[PDB]
Each structure stands twice: as structure tokens, then as C-alpha cells.
Amino acid sequence: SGFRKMAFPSGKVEGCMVQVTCGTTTLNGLWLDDVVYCPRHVICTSEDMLNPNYEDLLIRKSNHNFLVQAGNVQLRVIGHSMQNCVLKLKVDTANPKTPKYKFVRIQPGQTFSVLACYNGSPSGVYQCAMRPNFTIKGSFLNGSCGSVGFNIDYDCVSFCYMHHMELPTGVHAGTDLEGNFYGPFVDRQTAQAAGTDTTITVNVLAWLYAAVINGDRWFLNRFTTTLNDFNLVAMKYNYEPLTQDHVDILGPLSAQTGIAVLDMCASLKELLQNGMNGRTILGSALLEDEFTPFDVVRQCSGVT
Amino acid sequence: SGFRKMAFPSGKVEGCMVQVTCGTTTLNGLWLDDVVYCPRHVICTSEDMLNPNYEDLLIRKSNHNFLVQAGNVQLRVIGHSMQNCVLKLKVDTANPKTPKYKFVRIQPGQTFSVLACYNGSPSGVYQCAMRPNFTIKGSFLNGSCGSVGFNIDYDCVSFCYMHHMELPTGVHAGTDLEGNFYGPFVDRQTAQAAGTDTTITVNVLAWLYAAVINGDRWFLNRFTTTLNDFNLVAMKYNYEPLTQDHVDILGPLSAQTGIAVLDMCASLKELLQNGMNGRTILGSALLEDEFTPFDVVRQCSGVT
Ligand SMILES: COC(=O)c1ccc(S(N)(=O)=O)cc1
Ligand SMILES: COC(=O)c1ccc(S(N)(=O)=O)cc1
Numbered sequence: 001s002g003f004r005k006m007a008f009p010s011g012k013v014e015g016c017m018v019q020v021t022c023g024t025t026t027l028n029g030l031w032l033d034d035v036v037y038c039p040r041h042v043i044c045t046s047e048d049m050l051n052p053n054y055e056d057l058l059i060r061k062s063n064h065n066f067l068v069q070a071g072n073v074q075l076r077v078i079g080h081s082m083q084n085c086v087l088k089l090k091v092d093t094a095n096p097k098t099p100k101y102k103f104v105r106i107q108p109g110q111t112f113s114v115l116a117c118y119n120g121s122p123s124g125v126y127q128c129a130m131r132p133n134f135t136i137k138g139s140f141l142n143g144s145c146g147s148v149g150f151n152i153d154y155d156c157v158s159f160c161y162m163h164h165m166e167l168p169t170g171v172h173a174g175t176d177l178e179g180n181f182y183g184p185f186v187d188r189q190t191a192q193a194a195g196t197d198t199t200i201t202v203n204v205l206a207w208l209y210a211a212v213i214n215g216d217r218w219f220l221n222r223f224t225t226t227l228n229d230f231n232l233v234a235m236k237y238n239y240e241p242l243t244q245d246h247v248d249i250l251g252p253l254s255a256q257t258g259i260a261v262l263d264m265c266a267s268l269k270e271l272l273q274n275g276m277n278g279r280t281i282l283g284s285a286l287l288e289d290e291f292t293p294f295d296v297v298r299q300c301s302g303v304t
Numbered sequence: 305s306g307f308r309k310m311a312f313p314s315g316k317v318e319g320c321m322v323q324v325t326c327g328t329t330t331l332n333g334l335w336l337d338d339v340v341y342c343p344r345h346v347i348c349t350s351e352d353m354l355n356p357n358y359e360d361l362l363i364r365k366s367n368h369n370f371l372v373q374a375g376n377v378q379l380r381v382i383g384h385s386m387q388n389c390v391l392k393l394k395v396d397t398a399n400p401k402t403p404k405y406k407f408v409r410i411q412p413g414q415t416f417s418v419l420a421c422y423n424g425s426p427s428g429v430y431q432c433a434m435r436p437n438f439t440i441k442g443s444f445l446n447g448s449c450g451s452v453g454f455n456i457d458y459d460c461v462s463f464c465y466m467h468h469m470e471l472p473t474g475v476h477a478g479t480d481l482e483g484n485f486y487g488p489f490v491d492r493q494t495a496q497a498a499g500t501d502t503t504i505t506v507n508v509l510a511w512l513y514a515a516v517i518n519g520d521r522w523f524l525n526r527f528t529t530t531l532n533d534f535n536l537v538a539m540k541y542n543y544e545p546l547t548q549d550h551v552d553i554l555g556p557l558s559a560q561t562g563i564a565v566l567d568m569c570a571s572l573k574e575l576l577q578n579g580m581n582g583r584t585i586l587g588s589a590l591l592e593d594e595f596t597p598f599d600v601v602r603q604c605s606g607v608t
Contacts, residue, residue, distance in 0.1 A: 001474035004443040006428035009419060011315030115313060121608035124310035125429055137587060139308040141606040170305035170519060215474060275582070276589075283441060285580075285589030302445040304425035 003210045003282045005290065006299055007113035008152040010125040015097030018075070019120030020089070020146065021067035028117040028146030029068060029089070030159065030177070032098050036068050036075065036089040037177055038146045039164050040082055041187045049189040058082055069120060070095075085187045086162060086179030100156040103177040108132045109200040109240065111292050112149040112160050119143060128161075129203070129290040131171075132240055133195040134183025138163065138172035148177070154304075167192050200289040201239045202246040205264050206296040207288045209253035211281045213300050218279055220259070223266035230265040237272045249293045256300075307514045307586045309594065310603055311417035312456040314429040319401030322379070323424030324393070324450065325371035332421040332450030333372060333393070334463065334481070336402050340372050340379065340393040341481055342450045343468050344386055345491045353493040362386055373424060374399075389491045390466060390483030404460040407481040412436045413504040413544065415596050416453040416464050423447060432465075433507070433594040435475075436544055437499040438487025442467065442476035452481070458608075471496050504593040505543045506550040509568050510600040511592045513557035515585045517604050522583055524563070527570035534569040541576045553597045560604075 020029040020038040023045060029038035041049070043057045061080065066089050068075040079090030106112065111129045115122050116139060128136045128149060140147065140163055149161025164174045164187050171194055173185035185192055212220065225233075231241045247261045254261050268287070276285055297303075324333040324342040327349060333342035345353070347361045365384065370393050372379040383394030410416065415433045419426050420443060432440045432453060444451065444467055453465025468478045468491050475498055477489035489496055516524065529537075535545045551565045558565050572591070580589055601607075 001445075001470055002441055002443040002476065004428075004430040004441075005309060006420065006430045006443060007311060009315070009318050009426035009429055010313045011318035011426075014313050014315035116310065118606045118608050122313035122315075123606060123608040124308075124603070125313055126308040126310045137306055137308075139306040139310060139603055141305075141604075143606060166305055172306065278579070280590065286584065299428070299443055300445075302422045302427060302447060304422050304427040 001214055003214050003299065005127050006295075007125040007127045008150065010113065010115045010122065012099040012152065012157050013115045013148065013150055014122050016095060016099070017115065017117050017120050017122055019069040021069070022061065022065055026119055027143060028120055030146065030148050030162070031068075031070060031075070031091070031095040032101055034091055034094045036091055037086050037162065038089070039162060039175075039187065040085050040087050040179070041145065041164065042087060051188055051190075054082060071120075084179030085164065085175050085181060086177070102156060102158045104151070104158040104160050105176040105178070105180065106130050106160040108134060109203060109292070110160070111203075111290055111295055112151050114138060114147060114149050114161070114163070116140065116144055117147045127290065129200060130182060131194075132198040132200065134181075134185070135167065135171040135173055135194045135197070136161070140166060140172055149174075167194060169194065196238055199237070199239045199287065201234055201242045201268075202249060202293065203289040203291055204239070204268060204287045205242075205246075205250055205261065206253060206293040207282070207291045208264050208268060209250065209257055209259070210291060210296040210300060212257050212259060214282060216281050219267050219271055219281060221267050221270050223270065224260065224263045225266040225269055226262065230262070230269060233269045233272055239272070252297055253293060305518055307518050307603065309431050310599075311429040311431045312454065314417065314419045314426065316403040316456065316461050317419045317452065317454055318426050320399060320403070321419065321421050321424050321426055323373040325373070326365065326369055330423055331447060332424055334450065334452050334466070335372075335374060335379070335395070335399040336405055338395055338398045340395055341390050341466065342393070343466060343479075343491065344389050344391050344483070345449065345468065346391060355492055355494075358386060375424075386483075388483030389468065389479050389485060390481070406460060406462045408455070408462040408464050409480040409482070409484065410434050410464040412438060413507060413596070414464070415507075415594055415599055416455050418442060418451060418453050418465070418467070420444065420448055421451045431594065433504060434486060435498075436502040436504065438485075438489070439471065439475040439477055439498045439501070440465070444470060444476055453478075471498060473498065500542055503541070503543045503591065505538055505546045505572075506553060506597065507593040507595055508543070508572060508591045509546075509550075509554055509565065510557060510597040511586070511595045512568050512572060513554065513561055513563070514595060514600040514604060516561050516563060518586060520585050523571050523575055523585060525571050525574050527574065528564065528567045529570040529573055530566065534566070534573060537573045537576055543576070556601055557597060
């Protein structure tokens with residue numbers, strides 16, 4: 001019992017973290033096999049950052065200009081290329097700690113673990129969600145760029161995020177490991193406003209199921225609702241519309257708890273309309289939306 | 305920028321996690337050098353658990369009755385002893401992944417990372433606090449016992465917690481790595497009520513500093529207070545009394561932010577008396593008390 005914002009164990013990812021220095025800029029790189037992946041803004045000089053021409057900047061750069069340090073051993077760089085907003089640095093040595101991995105571009109509302117790193121050294125791990133507006137609410141200081149988001153399925157690390165920038169509003173933007181930004185964000189120092197940060201309805205509902213399972217039931221009501229009635233309320237409260245796919249994904253929590261998805265929807269509706277009235281749910285005074293149905297099932301069943 | 309409930313990277317601890325089976329009971333063990341540490345309740349049969357005589361139960365047990373599995377390789381057990389509520393199993397092989405470590409018994413209000421494990425396999429990592437009542441609010445299913453709490457200082461893992469039991473109220477109790485319970489808890493299936501769960505005042509104040517640093521300032525007021533005036537308010541709201549030691553420990557946050565500790569105290573007092581009025585602080589609708597001053601400094605400076 002008990003429910004926690006849990007991250008994946010970070011060990012498999014810790015052994016992939018390196019430091020990349022180009023000129024005077026140091027950030028984090030991810031070493032998988034004989035490739036080190038990092039943000040292409042490593043080639044930027046603080047003054048290039050207004051509108052960098054990365055193609056023009058990269059012409060000036062040779063294999064030997066990319067200093068790759070894995071702990072206190074230097075990697076020989078034998079090739080470099082730009083794929084979208086990441087650099088791939090071919091090194092002469094395959095990372096001996098390369099776990100089984102995949103690159104996956106995640107959907108908004110999906111959750112992952114961030115290993116926040118500085119100079120290729122891990123500082124901490126936390127659980128995040130890709131916000132509906134393709135930002136994440138992270139914890140990233142100067143030098144944290146190249147820190148990666150991942151999921152683990154038994155022994156396979158799915159890399160989904162590389163950290164690139166902080167928006168003027170102090171939310172975070174980044175790419176998948178093919179270097180495509182989540183959202184409309186570009187790797188340049190300019191006005192980038194995020195869109196409306198909507199609540200991930202299916203994740204709130206999953207977290208309400210997690211609460212019921214863990215004994216927090218005060219919010220279960222005598223009401224039900226329909227997908228259309230519910231979504232009228234979602235719309236008003238900047239909640240993502242709920243689909244039958246969402247309902248289906250909640251099926252195992254529904255089944256375990258014997259609370260119909262639409263009944264739980266009706267409990268959420270009352271919570272949105274009436275607030276918490278100074279009560280808490282799983283020690284939170286607001287509706288948590290950074291647990292997926294899969295996260296609830298995983299944590300409420302002991303998957304390793 | 306951004307502030308997250310961050311855990312230590314868990315890799316150093318992942319390589320210490322083993323499975324311990326005695327009879328039909330399996331739980332987690334911690335392998336450091338040639339010793340595996342686990343809860344002594346591994347020797348209990350579901351029926352011993354009402355009032356086990358661990359000395360009498362342990363007489364029936366031989367080195368070969370303790371099955372220690374590290375991944376899918378078995379460790380030879382060459383000695384066993386009970387220290388308080390843990391078993392130490394001497395094995396014939398030193399863990400080759402033994403990090404630098406210490407056993408430390410933490411103070412209430414102190415924070416640590418839990419690597420939650422099942423059958424010696426890590427499932428997740430989260431950040432906890434030793435509550436003032438010597439419980440932790442964890443996430444532990446059947447088979448999670450022997451999961452450990454730790455801090456990391458550069459390269460040295462300080463082990464502070466081994467998980468032992470869930471109280472009837474679904475909070476968690478456990479020992480240090482010398483097998484002494486935090487609090488008055490015993491490893492037996494009986495009525496164990498925790499005391500009053502007070503709020504860790506110094507940690508709330510640290511988190512208010514973290515908020516100001518990160519741009520969340522709405523709660524900064526025109527008031528100050530005294531240690532004695534403040535503690536009158538703390539007492540009423542089941543907040544731990546604040547001492548000059550607490551004030552001293554907040555000194556660097558005071559200095560960085562230029563907000564006197566007692567002024568921040570006066571902001572907290574108003575928050576306790578007036579509530580949040582539906583506002584949030586670092587995305588929380590209640591006062592967070594599971595960041596220490598050291599955690600705020602660490603996260604707000606990039607320590608690895
Ligand atoms: C490569 O440069 C960038 O990608 C970048 C973007 C945004 C900002 S910020 N915090 O001024 O908005 C700073 C740097
Ligand atoms: C070794 O046995 C125990 O330490 C123990 C303590 C408490 C409980 S519980 N959840 O019934 O209160 C169950 C088992």
C-alpha cells in the first residue's frame with residue numbers, strides 16, 4: 001500500500017551518461033554502442049544562440065573538436081553528423097554498459113523518468129509527463145542539457161526525451177533521440193510561448209483508481225455520467241477530452257476496483273465542480289495527472 | 305529552474321540488491337562486500353508472525369537454508385547472524401559492485417531515496433522523509449521488504465533504511481542497517497499505532513525558499529515574527545517547533561534569497577492561518593515538508 005511518484009531505477013541510464021565539450025560549452029551526452037547523442041546546441045557560442053545557423057556552425061567543427069569524456073576516460077571521436085537537433089558522435093569504443101534500448105517518440109500525457117545530469121554526472125531522477133502542450137515541468141539548471149527521459153520494460157530502456165532548453169516561463173522543451181522537438185519548439189534563444197497546459201484526464205482517472213485501491217475513497221459519489229456530459233465539464237476545466245480509447249485503457253482498473261469508468265468520471269466531475277473542500281487524495285490537495293493507467297497497474301501490482 | 309521531488313540515481317544500489325529465500329518466504333537483501341543484509345522476518349512462516357521468537361526460529365536454520373540469488377547466480381552462504389531485526393548472511397563472494405557506503409541512522413525530518421524491489425529486482429525509486437513519528441509514507445507491496453533507503457554524497461552511499469512492515473494504517477516502518485527500528489515499532493503482526501504525524505517545519509521553510517528562487521513568490525508578505533510567536537502557530541497546526549539550529553540550517557537559503565528566516569516564518573504563519581486560497585506553490589496545493597534545506601541547496605545548485 002501507499003502510492004508514490006515513482007521513477008524507473010536509473011542505473012541502466014547512469015552507465016550511458018557522458019560529458020560532451022565543444023569549444024567552451026559542456027553538456028551531457030548519451031553513449032549507446034559506438035554513438036554519443038547530444039543536443040546540437042553544444043556547437044553554439046553564447047552569442048550564436050539568437051539565430052544559430054547549425055549547418056554553417058558545424059562546417060567549422062572537426063571530430064577532434066568534440067571532447068567526449070566518460071567518467072575520467074576520453075573517447076576518440078571518429079565521426080560526427082547532425083540528425084535534426086541532435087549530434088551523433090561516432091566513437092571508436094562501444095559503451096560496454098549499453099543496455100537493451102529503443103528510441104521512442106512518446107504521446108502527450110505519457111510519463112517517463114528523467115536522469116538529470118551535469119558534466120555527464122547524474123544528480124537525480126524524477127518522474128515527468130509530456131504535457132499536452134509538449135512541454136515538461138522539469139528541474140534543469142545550466143549544464144543539464146543532454147539529460148534524457150526514458151521508460152524501462154523489464155531490461156529494455158526506451159529513450160523518449162533529450163533535454164534542450166528552458167522556456168522564458170521556466171518550463172522545459174526537448175527532442176526525441178532522433179532530435180525532433182516535442183511541440184513547435186526550436187533550439188534558439190527567442191520568444192517561445194507554450195500553449196494551454198491542459199490536464200491529462202485519463203491520468204487523473206487512473207490516479208483516482210490508485211486512490212480507491214489504497215483506501216482514499218471519500219470522493220466516490222452516487223452519480224454516473226456519459227462521455228459527452230463528462231467532456232462538457234472537462235472542456236470548462238481545461239481537461240483533455242476523454243475518448244473510448246481512454247475508457248478502454250482504464251478497463252483493468254475498472255475491473256480490479258469494480259468502479260465503472262463513467263462512475264469514476266462522475267466522481268471527477270463533482271471534484272472539478274466542488275473542489276477538494278480542504279481534503280487530500282493520496283496526500284495531494286489537487287488532482288494528479290502524471291500517472292498513466294499503466295503506471296497505476298505497474299505500481300499497484302509490483303512489476304520489476 | 306523548476307523544482308521536483310528528486311531521488312538519488314539508484315544505480316549504485318541496484319547492483320547491491322539480491323533475493324533472499326528462507327523456507328517459502330522471499331524478500332530483498334542488500335549485498336555489500338561478502339555480507340547480505342535482510343529483515344530477520346525472512347525466517348518467519350505466515351503463522352509465526354503473531355509473536356515470533358526469532359532466537360528460537362533461527363536455531364532451526366542453517367547456512368544452506370538461506371537461498372541468496374543475485375540476478376540468476378546463487379551465492380554460497382558460509383555464515384549467518386541476527387543483529388537486532390536484520391540477518392547478516394556471510395557469503396563466499398564480495399559483491400563486485402559494492403559502492404563506497406556507510407550505515408547511518410537518520411534523524412526524523414531527514415529525507416532519503418527508496419529503491420523499491422521485488423525478488424531482488426528493482427521496480428522504482430522515490431524520495432521519502434523519516435516522519436517525526438518514525439514512519440515513512442512509502443509504496444510497498446508484498447515482497448518489497450528488504451528494500452533500502454539511502455543518500456549519496458558524491459560516490460559514497462549512506463544506507464539509512466531497510467523496509468520491514470506496513471502498519472494497519474498503510475504507513476511503513478523499518479530499521480537502519482544495524483536492524484534497529486525507527487520509532488517504537490517491532491517486527492511482529494500486532495496493533496502498532498503511529499503517533500501524531502507532525503509537519504517538518506524547517507523542510508516547509510526550505511521549500512518556500514526553493515519556491516521564491518523558482519519564481520513562486522505570491523505568498524511573501526509584509527510581516528515578520530519571532531521564534532516564540534511562530535512556534536505558538538506551529539504548535540496549533542501540528543508543525544514541529546522551530547529552533548535556532550533550524551534557522552542556522554536555513555542560513556544559505558536566507559543569504560541566497562535575501563529573505564530573513566523569521567520573515568519566511570511569518571509568510572508560513574499566514575499560509576497556515578489563511579490557507580492557499582486555491583493557489584499553488586511549485587505545483588502543490590499544500591505545504592511540502594519532504595525537502596530538507598540541503599535538498600533545496602543541492603537541487604538549486606546542480607550538485608552531482
Ligand atoms: C540554443 O539556444 C536555445 O535553444 C535557447 C532557447 C531559449 C532560451 S531562453 N531561456 O532565453 O528563452 C535560451 C536558449
Ligand atoms: C514479521 O511480521 C511483521 O512484522 C508484521 C507487522 C505488522 C503486520 S500488519 N500489516 O498486520 O499490521 C504484519 C506483519
